[PDB]
């Protein structure tokens, strides 16, 4: 009855989701089925049958024999344990030659990679009455009308399964090491905006349904973060274009007094009068507050808006969050300079960061390559590189890139743990407090931080941008503070560059 | 924090869904927390702590101490058993005065009635990071833009919790008795189209989440059925208005031969030359095929479209199914005359049935009374009675009602099991085969039927229409065939009529 639901593909044609035939176990227990037959067509020994069935379906013989003993029933099924059985399960059941036992073909949605870009691909759910499948999250839901049928259309993603494996492995390592409450990593083509890989933790397995529903939100498009100091790059860009930033000019570091709050550099005492470039390498908060004064508060708010913040990127993901620029008072304004109070989505961060490597042009990130029917060959949609806006000049973009280089590679860098032997890396570190969901403060604890890194490589002319973020390590929180996401950035970026044939040296 | 999510109300202002404060259990286990303190601020006695917590949260003391022994962790939590704790649990944990133990407030979505109109109300799921709630099904999803905030708007439904209680209890009894694969009942105000009660089985509990996801489809709006002989009332109305049906005129019963299929009256042999009125009371299939010949197949197809079949009712529910009139050959056309091949939604059946009690006007069924903000008092939406179309004259409607009376109350009735002592009832029975999801044909088995009853009372001038359907009884399938859904219709209708102050005779 149901039309075949279309497939979801990665950018090289690997199947990410497709319909398959599986099998459901049925046991006829009524004698009436065997009235006309010499060999029985119903279960004659319920105990032996239960014992043999327990060697295939995940159910104890005692529960099977209980289900076989239901009164006033012609045939029985075994709930979830008796459905979605494989062809090999079917073979071993059938070789037992158990009277009354058969297997019914049923259509199931199959995700060949299991837990793999799960919050992007989503999950399609089955209506048992009809077999009708309906997407409940991500691409399966966004494109449900196209995917469902004739035959539904296929959706091709920009995701590269080879790069996605690197991301899934690195994120597993972060879970083991740090048990964070939230975790994401994303890899984008620095020159086109294509999402090459995306994952988050915790997540679900779309194949089995394990943990589906425990977190509805996709981190890339629907979750918001106070970004911390990765956000300083946009304040730097603005201050550069306005002439307030001079890399060699000195400024007074240490602290600033804003509406009765002491906002200090991370070492409390500062470094005296130091060049602005060094302050950016040190990730000086007083530098950013100084530059905001020089530019002017009204102008800086417009600057963050021109970089796309506070607005949806208008991607094809459902319910994209807008974030919010925290600007309601001077304290909010000043803390926004280093990525506190303001909330962003990771996709806004990627869009904004792409400006520095595309002559000032922001690229709209995208992950849908095409929607098209393989039978009719109709192309309903084709993704493309699109400029989201040009907030800065090419000259400003280069001067920002020079400072991002210094953050990682300066002889005074405090981010050398993001270096990769053989490759040149650049980017910006972040450590931020995390808003408590309930009650009006920050999560309390020894190191209750969202730590992140917006990185790109090769430096100056990158092939990819890799952004990774970790919220609230429940294990090794002190090291999470010290090393940030470097134990995820380094395996993802190194393997990705090798796979993209970037020569090491 | 998140704005308060708006409430879902029943028609009398009873809360169906609301935000509440609950509590999450946290245990600080690292000694470092107690460095400066005159009282320990971490769990010092792991066994005494675990033993005492087991008297509140539902966990074995051995498991609790296992989690208290996690290494390199400042504090731990206790999974699902440790969240959604009540204010009373908070009191009981706190008088225990356990060092290191506190409770964090969290906002949860509370459904005070538990498993109650679950497939209509739906469920909102929580993002652990932010506390943000998002509707995943039903009203919570449909109106999620309104419900989420300030404060979200409230949604008021037409549902009456008192009638809804009757439906839930009756459906539980049908599950206990027949263990059907699918089951629904709906109660509609016969003069306004308001849905006073709706339930289905199997379903989920929106409070706990138990079984949420096993069936995405709301039976009323999204599931389709081959209705069986309840569909005959619309062919009857057509034949009346076209002058083909005359209650006293004779016709030849027995069987008909259509494209190599023998279609018989239910007793195989028929009853000879009998009055058309009696044929309709006996639920004669040959009567309906004869009337279709008399009207003409092209014209009958237009008749069903005029009753709203094959098209969505344009209700407020997402993804409403349109169904389909099966008309592609004479076999489909003839089997459609008695409700096979054509598929309908229950809401189309209610809409079509309302014509007989509103002088030929179909009423568009509706379940949303209001969407409105309790703070601003802005009314975003107000539901109302709306005519879906007038397919028949008042004269035709009266003549149909006379035949519906006879089905139940004729001295030759085969539906006397739908009678209610003290109340006058009318309606139409149905028994239909069920299409197999995979492979062609119908579900096989001794009595593999969708059985149903489209009823209304008091007869002629009803207060409510009650439509109940049961697909594929897995227990007592013989009784399901004999009694249909009478064991649900009678308690629902009787209790509803008493609750609505209809006096019994
Ligand atoms: C940007 O992220 C900046 N971070 C903060 O000032 C900051 C902190 C903090 C935590 C621990 C020690 C000092 C400060 N908590 O919330 C915020 C917003 C600077 N950059 C960071 C980085 O990781 O590069 C730091 C730690 C150097 S401070
Ligand atoms: C309408 O529902 C009609 N039903 C059928 O003819 C029918 C059957 C069937 C099942 C069992 C015995 C005889 C027929 N299977 O599929 C169909 C479409 C008539 N009305 C029914 C009713 O309950 O009123 C019956 C059983 C009287 S036949």
From TrEMBL, chains A, B:
It comes from the Bacteria. It is found in: Membrane. Its main location: membrane. The keyword Membrane applies. One of its GO terms (cellular component) is plasma membrane. GO terms for biological process: cell wall organization. The keyword Glycosyltransferase does not apply. Keywords: Membrane, Transmembrane, Transmembrane helix. GO terms for molecular function: penicillin binding. Belongs to the transpeptidase family. This is Penicillin-binding protein 1. The lineage of its organism: Bacteria, Bacillati, Bacillota, Bacilli, Bacillales. The chain holds residues 61 to 590 of 744 of the full protein.
């Amino acid at each position: 009855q149901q039309p075949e639901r279309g497939k979801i593909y990665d950018r090289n044609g690997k199947v990410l989701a497709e319909d398959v035939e599986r099998y459901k176990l049925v046991a006829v227990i009524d004698k009436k089925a065997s009235a006309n037959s010499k060999k029985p067509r119903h279960v004659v020994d319920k105990k032996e049958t239960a014992k043999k069935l327990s060697t295939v379906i995940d159910m104890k013989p005692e529960e099977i024999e209980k289900r076989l003993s239901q009164k006033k029933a012609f045939q029985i099924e075994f709930g979830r344990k008796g459905t979605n059985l494989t062809y090999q399960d079917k073979l071993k059941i059938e070789k037992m030659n158990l009277p009354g036992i058969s297997l019914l073909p049923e259509t199931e949605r199959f995700y060949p990679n299991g837990n793999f870009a799960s919050h992007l691909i989503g999950r399609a759910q089955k209506n048992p009455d009809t077999g009708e499948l309906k997407g409940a999250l991500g691409v399966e839901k966004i494109f449900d009308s196209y995917l469902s049928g004739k035959r539904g259309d296929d959706v091709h993603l920009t995701i590269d399964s080879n790069i996605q494996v690197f991301v899934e492995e690195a994120l597993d390592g972060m879970v083991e090491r740090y048990q964070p409450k939230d975790l994401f990593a994303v890899v984008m083509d620095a020159k086109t905006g294509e999402i090459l890989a995306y994952s988050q933790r915790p997540t679900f397995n779309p194949e089995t349904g394990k943990d589906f529903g425990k977190k509805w939100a996709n981190d890339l498009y629907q979750n918001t973060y106070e970004p911390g100091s990765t956000f300083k790059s946009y304040g730097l860009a603005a201050a550069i274009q306005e002439g307030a930033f001079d890399p060699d000019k000195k400024y007074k570091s240490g602290h600033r007094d804003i509406m009765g709050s002491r906002i200090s550099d991370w070492n409390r005492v500062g470094w005296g009068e130091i060049p602005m470039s060094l302050g950016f390498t040190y990730s000086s908060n007083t530098l950013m507050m100084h530059l905001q004064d020089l530019v002017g508060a009204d102008k800086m708010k417009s600057w963050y808006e021109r970089f796309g913040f506070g607005k949806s990127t208008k991607g094809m993901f459902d319910g994209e969050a807008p974030g919010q620029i925290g600007w309601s008072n001077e304290l909010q304004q000043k803390t926004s300079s280093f990525g506190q109070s303001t909330t962003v989505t990771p996709v806004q961060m990627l869009q904004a960061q792409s400006a520095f490597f595309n002559d000032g042009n922001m690229l709209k990130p995208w992950f849908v390559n095409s929607v098209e029917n393989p039978v009719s060959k109709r192309q309903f949609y084709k993704g493309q590189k699109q400029i989201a806006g040009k907030p800065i000049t090419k000259d400003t973009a280069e001067k920002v890139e020079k400072q991002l280089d210094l953050v990682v590679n300066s002889k005074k860098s405090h981010a050398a743990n993001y270096r990769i032997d053989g490759y040149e890396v650049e980017g910006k570190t972040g450590t931020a407090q995390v808003a408590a969901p309930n009650g009006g403060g920050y999560v309390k604890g020894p190191n209750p931080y969202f730590v992140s890194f917006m990185g790109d490589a090769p430096k100056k002319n990158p092939k990819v941008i890799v952004y990774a973020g970790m919220s609230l390590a429940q294990k090794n929180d002190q090291e999470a503070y010290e090393l940030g996401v470097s134990k995820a950035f380094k395996p993802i970026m190194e393997n990705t560059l090798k796979y993209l044939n970037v020569g090491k040296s």
